[PDB]
Amino acid sequence: GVCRCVCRRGVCRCVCRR
16 A cells, blocks of 8 residues: 655656555
């Protein structure tokens, strides 16, 4: 349920976990 977004080079990679 927790989504973290890692933004790099304008691209955000979101990873959802629980």
